[PDB]
Amino acid sequence: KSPFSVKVGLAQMLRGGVIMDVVNAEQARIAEEAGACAVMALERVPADIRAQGGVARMSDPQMIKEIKQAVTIPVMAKARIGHFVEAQILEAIGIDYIDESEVLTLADEDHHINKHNFRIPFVCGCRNLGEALRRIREGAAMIRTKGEAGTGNIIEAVRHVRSVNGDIRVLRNMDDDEVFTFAKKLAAPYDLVMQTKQLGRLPVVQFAAGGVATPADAALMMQLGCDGVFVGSGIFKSGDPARRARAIVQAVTHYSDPEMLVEVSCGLGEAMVGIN
Amino acid sequence: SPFSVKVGLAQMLRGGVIMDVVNAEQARIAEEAGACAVMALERVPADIRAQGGVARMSDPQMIKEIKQAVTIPVMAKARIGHFVEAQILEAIGIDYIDESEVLTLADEDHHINKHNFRIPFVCGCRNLGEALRRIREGAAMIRTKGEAGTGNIIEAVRHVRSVNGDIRVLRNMDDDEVFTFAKKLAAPYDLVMQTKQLGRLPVVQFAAGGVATPADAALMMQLGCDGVFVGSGIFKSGDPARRARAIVQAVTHYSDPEMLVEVSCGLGEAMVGIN
Amino acid sequence: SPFSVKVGLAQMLRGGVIMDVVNAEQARIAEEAGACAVMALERVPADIRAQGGVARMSDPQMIKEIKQAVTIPVMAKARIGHFVEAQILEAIGIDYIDESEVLTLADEDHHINKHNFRIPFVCGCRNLGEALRRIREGAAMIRTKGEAGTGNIIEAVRHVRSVNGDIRVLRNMDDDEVFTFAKKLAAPYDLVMQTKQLGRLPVVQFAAGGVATPADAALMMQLGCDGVFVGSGIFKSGDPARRARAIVQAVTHYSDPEMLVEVSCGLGEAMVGIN
Amino acid sequence: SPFSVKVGLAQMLRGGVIMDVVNAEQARIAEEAGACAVMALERVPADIRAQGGVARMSDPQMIKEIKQAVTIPVMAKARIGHFVEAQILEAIGIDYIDESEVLTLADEDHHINKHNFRIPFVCGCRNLGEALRRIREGAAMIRTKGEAGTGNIIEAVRHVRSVNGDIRVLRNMDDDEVFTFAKKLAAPYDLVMQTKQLGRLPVVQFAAGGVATPADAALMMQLGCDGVFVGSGIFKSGDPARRARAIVQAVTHYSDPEMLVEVSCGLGEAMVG
Amino acid sequence: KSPFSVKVGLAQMLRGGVIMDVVNAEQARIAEEAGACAVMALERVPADIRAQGGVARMSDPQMIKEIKQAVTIPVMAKARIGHFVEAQILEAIGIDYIDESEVLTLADEDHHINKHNFRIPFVCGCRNLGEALRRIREGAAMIRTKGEAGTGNIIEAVRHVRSVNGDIRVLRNMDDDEVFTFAKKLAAPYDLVMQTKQLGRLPVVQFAAGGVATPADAALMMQLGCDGVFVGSGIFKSGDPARRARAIVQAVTHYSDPEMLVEVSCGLGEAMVGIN
């Protein structure tokens, strides 16, 4: 019944899905046709931001509108961390989600966007449970790992998923009397720590993000417990984007089916090169 | 709510002096002087400091004796984290438990889950974040820690100014910056916001630690405290009953320098203390 | 006082964008875009940063050409501490001098004694103490320093939040603590108290440094600034005249997301900048 | 009344010795020796230093006894930051409050807002910036801190030379450099400029801390002080009443070596320190 | 009446003047025609010494003689610090001043030239009052700041002028009894410290030098209290040497006239690029 619960419910519709970064309408159509649950509209994917440098900002509303016109699935877009006016603009465009993203150039070193001031749901990144809960308290309706975006290397995403999931599991059997100190150690709001304890999971949808390059990577994130995956660079920086996009979608939908994972991985073409 | 009931109970002590007492006779002296409550304990902080050893919850027998000797509320101390000492104190029927750093720490990592009790708790603090963490654990009343048993108010002044200063910072603070402020304070965001909304601590806030003279006590009141604890400064002084009354009068009339002069004049030796 | 007249004069710039311009055509573009003033200089900060060398007061000839091309006020930069550069700029008859850290520092230890001048000065700052020190030296207007020429607003945000945050802290502070606060700021106490009483900086306060997009400009306004400087972000972008208008409109309509969408839509490539 | 009234009041003490006294008899001795004021306190700095413990405002009763025993102004000490001790002292009707580092610090971060009081305050300093910060808070009179209770003038000499030296530097400084000088001093620019224009401290400036002998006192005056405090040097010495008169004479006649010889000759044992 | 006083008096004839580094007779004539009070004859200006590296020494006497023949104003030339034989040669050429210069390659790390052994007046550089007085005690009849030569950046010259001038001002009101310790702190001869105190200024002419690139720079040095300015690189490394040379001369002669400073700065062409 609360406005936040409605936002949380909206993000829950993306469960089981792949969200694909797209830089134009053609890629948006490829993503939707491959079965993406949503597209992330942006002018440069993380691998290109990482390689090219320069300040990375909110994308031009015109290019976001073109992508939004080109698909029927939900459209997300990125705002710089702390750049609440970029978020105001994105919301006024009429898109479905805002990603307050560390992949763009940090705009406010000390504060994130007060996301409760918006009608549109936000996704935020995290490396650990305390960070996830702090973003949620600011009003994020959806959490993803940060991983190491644009590297094609899942090691940090695995670290982040295992960190969040591990500390959630720690909460299950924890002495209630020890949770106050745990919340302090996490620098997380105690009421959200307690809610996570009661739920046995994050109070919002939890996606894997950062470095997902192969169907195996994506199914690994789902088997670790994520609700879905972002793929920013691994699809359209690969040798066969449309096929790999479908492959990753199938891997997320059928993550427990090794026969399917073989089938969609077989002859998939060159994955993104990435950085170790 | 049960917590708000406990918070209301502690609010009845506003404007008051709570005096540490080690026997029924000191308790009677405290009540006759106008203390709003007594803190029943076997040793006052100055003596705990000088003597060393492990300091624990006092014998229930001596607490009951003090409780029987007065009609004002009776508090007693439990070691930090020692929730069974608190269970015993509650079962004695006293009015408040001070989860006290003056006693020997029992749990280095956790305080008592005070929400598990019907009796209101007092907790100490040095800053706003610590106050709010104690309140989240269920403290219905907050005092500064100061430096107990030294007769030196410098640390209590620091803690009062720290808590009060950060509360004032909250008032005009950009709402969007409060999340980071709560993180910096390691404090529950919701209690930080409640504090911002109230413009004061969400529970009664007493000065404690080193209050030795009427001037000290009135200083704490002018700094904004709701009351003061005096642990050592009365009965370690040369004229306990007179100093007890003088400090009570100083807290009741903290803005009246003529009264502060009168009650301080010819008061006898304060406690020696330590610098 | 003469200082209060200069301070009063700068109030007309509230709600405005000041644009760095390197020739008369750019100055005309700026004015036609609705700039409240132009900053005449031979090289914008992004170019100074990229090229290195010593960056000085611009040739009076090119400043006069820009002054003759526009009817809005014209500012020009002097190196920090270079009071003779400022004497020259004043004798040109421009409207403001920006004693600017973007030019090469000329005096590592002292700024210009701006009270010696009839022309009002703008100075940069990173925090409230710096702002108040510049004001005491005679700055009639303050801007953040940000990170000039990078197209990255992160440092400007830091500076705006620092100045505004300390003003908000100061507003509510115990009067008795303001002496120590002034010491900690290394700022003149009387100016600190005037800032406390006003609840804002005693002079016009602009954002500056890295403002690259309409969203950036409106963000500075929503944080509480009176206006913005744009040095590099307009004429180092793909469509300067359009971006110039968009940033002006963003500052005018900073609380209108529908207008911010409109002016940002199809704006062309922003300056690439440096992270 | 404005701050300038308090500043003008304190100017009456110029040329004087202020003597710490612990009872009415010493107060009489001090006044009869020619003290310009007495500092009423339960224990002098040498004893506070030696005995330790928390040192606080003295009992109003003993302060009143001293105030009744003498006609010269009576000062008393409040702990730094202890504005309620100052309220009590003011309500006693004494003439000056010394917000004194010799007592136990009560507020590590803030001094008393002395402009909130009608009675003038004395504060200590070790350098010009400190003096100006105390003045801006409302001190109507400045003394050096020295190293109180030691009978050793070396720190007081340091503090006097520091304050006087920086005032002299300030007097001739390029006006354009004064902004940075005020920042370096962490001092209010306006008071810095007032000091520059006046050419001396804007309030009476006394030496204090360790003044043990007539030679000590005369040295402080020759360095340029307006007067001297003597807390422990007189009554912790062999013959207090004679040393009290000798130090008063030394301050009144600080440029006369023949007088300094006379008053120092056979003066008895100074404080050991 | 003393030989040193005569040397000091000779340098005082340069008050109000600009001294210009020149590398040939044509530049010498430009400098004189622009109104320089003297020329500094040298094979390479500081900006070129700084850029090119290599050991920088006394210039060939032949090129110094050619410059001396080409002008009627006094001619100075540089000797390496400590290179008293270079100074002997320069004196025997018949030039008017020797600059024992840090711009040339140091020849003696521990000792300067004993300048009292010469009939010709010396100029020496300094960063602070103690250094100035030490050079004077060795026999320098003229002092300049060192600044940062060849950079076109006046910040260090401003530092040096303010340091020397500041400590001279400190002397005015200083307790006489404190001057012994002040002289020790300055590592300066006490008698020269006392003389500076009595004069209220340096006992010799005091010029600004190092990084003076514009008329504004030069007038700034004069307003700070200097008696004149050296310009080594800022004139002939600029876009219009003869015009800038005149402009700087006028700025020094009329340093308190902002209308004149505007006039001579207007359309002056590109200043030397220099180094930050």
Judge contact between B115 and B137, C-beta under 8 A: yes
Q: Among this protein's residues, is D236 annotated catalytic? A: no
CA distances from C18 to C72, C253, E11 (A): 10, 16, 50
Take residue D92 and report the two structure tokens written for it: 């006693």
The subunits that touch chain D, with at least 3 C-beta pairs less than 8 Å apart, are: B, C, E
CA distance D171 to B13: 58
Judge contact between B227 and B206, C-beta under 8 A: yes
Known binding residue E167? Answer is no
From chain C, pick out residues whose CB is under 8 angstroms from the CB of E238. none
Q: Using CB atoms within 10 A of its CB, is residue B96 exposed (0-12), middle (13-18) or buried (19+)?
A: buried
Q: Do B261 and D110 touch (CB under 8 A)?
A: no
From chain D, pick out residues whose CB is under 8 angstroms from the CB of B212. 54, 56
Strands B96-100 and D204-206: unpaired
Task: List, as one string, the DSSP characters of chain D.
Answer: --HHHHHHHHGGGTTEEEEEESSHHHHHHHHHHT-SEEEE-SS-HHHHHHH-S---PPPHHHHHHHHHH-SS-EEEEEETT-HHHHHHHHHHT-SEEEEETTSPPS-SS----GGG-SS-EEEEESSHHHHHHHHHTTEEEEEE---TTS---HHHHHHHHHHHHHHHHHHHS-GGGHHHHHHHHT--HHHHHHHHHHTS-SSEEEB-SS--SHHHHHHHHHHT-SEEEESSTTTTSS-HHHHHHHHHHHHHTTT-HHHHHHHHTT--PPP--
Q: Do B113 and A176 touch (CB under 8 A)?
A: yes
From chain A, pick out residues whose CB is under 8 angstroms from the CB of C260. 85, 88-89, 92
Take residue D253 and report the two structure tokens written for it: 């006649």
Judge contact between A93 and A67, C-beta under 8 A: no
From chain E, pick out residues whose CB is under 8 angstroms from the CB of D164. 175
CA distance C257 to A91: 8
Q: Do E166 and D172 touch (CB under 8 A)?
A: no
For tokens 């600004």, name the residue: E208
A117, closest residue in chain B (CA to CA): B176
Nearest neighbour of B153 by CB, restricted to D59, D106, D110: D106
CB pairs under 8 A between A and C: 80
Residue of B189, B193, B196 best to disrupt the A interface, most CBs of A under 10 A? B189
CA distances from C256 to A91, C252, C260, C265, E118 (A): 12, 9, 6, 14, 79
Catalytic residue chosen out of the listed positions C67, C77, C145, C236: C77
From chain D, pick out residues whose CB is under 8 angstroms from the CB of B151. 53-54
Q: Do D84 and B260 touch (CB under 8 A)?
A: yes
Q: Do C260 and A111 touch (CB under 8 A)?
A: no
Helices then strands, each counted (H, E), chain B? 12, 8
For tokens 């004229």, name the residue: B239
Take residue D184 and report the two structure tokens written for it: 């370096």
CA distances from C153 to B183, C148, C247 (A): 24, 9, 14
Active site residues per annotation of E: 78
CA distance A41 to A52: 19
CA distance B229 to B159: 14
Structure determined via = X-ray
The subunits that touch chain B, with at least 3 C-beta pairs less than 8 Å apart, are: A, C, D
- Name the 3-class secondary structure at B125: strand
Catalytic residue chosen out of the listed positions A7, A78, A115, A237: A78
CA distance D23 to D58: 11
Question: What percent of chain A is helix, strand and coil (3-state, nearest 5)?
Answer: 45, 15, 40
Judge contact between E126 and E190, C-beta under 8 A: no
How long, in residues, is chain E? 276
| Contact partners, residue D17, CB within 8 Å, separation at least 6 | D34, D35, D36, D217, D227, D228, D229, D230, D244, D247, D248, D251
E264, closest residue in chain C (CA to CA): C60
C183, closest residue in chain D (CA to CA): D186
C52, closest residue in chain E (CA to CA): E276
H or E stretch at B13: none
3-state secondary structure chain C: CHHHHHHHHHHHHCCEEEEEECCHHHHHHHHHCCCCEEEECCCCHHHHHHHCCCCCCCCHHHHHHHHHHCCCCEEEEEECCCHHHHHHHHHHCCCEEEEECCCCCCCCCCCCCHHHCCCCEEEEECCHHHHHHHHHHCCCEEEECCCCCCCCCHHHHHHHHHHHHHHHHHHHCCHHHHHHHHHHHCCCHHHHHHHHHHCCCCCEEEECCCCCCHHHHHHHHHHCCCEEEECCCCCCCCCHHHHHHHHHHHHHCCCCHHHHHHHHCCCCCCCCCCC
D173, closest residue in chain E (CA to CA): E169
Judge contact between C146 and C155, C-beta under 8 A: yes
Q: How many CB atoms lie within 10 A of CB A159?
A: 17
Q: Do C169 and B171 touch (CB under 8 A)?
A: no
Judge contact between B142 and B135, C-beta under 8 A: yes
Instruction: Provide the angle, in degrees to the nearest 10, between the axes of the packed helices D83-92 and D60-69.
Output: 40
Minimal CA separation from A37 to chain C, in Å: 26
Judge contact between B95 and B37, C-beta under 8 A: yes
Judge contact between D79 and D106, C-beta under 8 A: yes
Structural domain for B1, as ranges: 1-275
Judge contact between E121 and E143, C-beta under 8 A: no
For tokens 């100029």, name the residue: E123
Distance between the two ends of chain D, CA-based, in angstroms?
41
Minimal CA separation from C180 to chain B, in Å: 13
Minimal CA separation from C96 to chain D, in Å: 20
- Contacting D with CB below 8 Å, chain E residues are 162, 165-166, 169-170, 172-175, 178
Q: How many CB atoms lie within 10 A of CB A263?
A: 14
CA distance C251 to D42: 66
From chain B, pick out residues whose CB is under 8 angstroms from the CB of A178. 109-110
Minimal CA separation from A118 to chain C, in Å: 12
User: What are the binding residues of C?
Assistant: 20, 149, 161, 210, 231-232
CA distance E87 to E99: 9
Q: After which residues is chain A broken (C to N over 2.5 A)?
A: none
D224, closest residue in chain E (CA to CA): E175
CA distances from E182 to B180, E174, E186 (A): 51, 9, 6
| Contact partners, residue B269, CB within 8 Å, separation at least 6 | B237, B238, B239
Residue B74, domain CATH: 3.20.20.70
How long, in residues, is chain D? 273
Q: Do D179 and C113 touch (CB under 8 A)?
A: yes
Q: Do D168 and E174 touch (CB under 8 A)?
A: yes
From chain D, pick out residues whose CB is under 8 angstroms from the CB of E165. 174
- Resolution for the entry shown, Å: 1.9
CB pairs under 8 A between B and C: 26
Known binding residue E211? Answer is yes
Closest to A39 (Cα-Cα) out of A5, A9, A63: A63
Handedness of CA C100, C101, C104, C108 (dihedral sign): positive
Q: Do C169 and B174 touch (CB under 8 A)?
A: no
Strands of the sheet with E205-207, listed across from one edge: E205-207, E142-145, E122-126, E97-101, E75-80, E38-41, E17-22, E228-231
From chain D, pick out residues whose CB is under 8 angstroms from the CB of E175. 161, 164-165, 168
CA distance A82 to A124: 11
Q: Do E174 and D161 touch (CB under 8 A)?
A: no
Q: Do C165 and B171 touch (CB under 8 A)?
A: no
If one counts the domains in chain C, the total is: 1
CA distance D158 to D161: 5
Strands D96-100 and D74-79: parallel
| Contact partners, residue E53, CB within 8 Å, separation at least 6 | none
CA distance D49 to D41: 14
CA distance B268 to B260: 15
Task: List, as one string, the DSSP characters of E85-98.
Answer: HHHHHHHHHT-SEE
Q: Do C111 and D177 touch (CB under 8 A)?
A: no
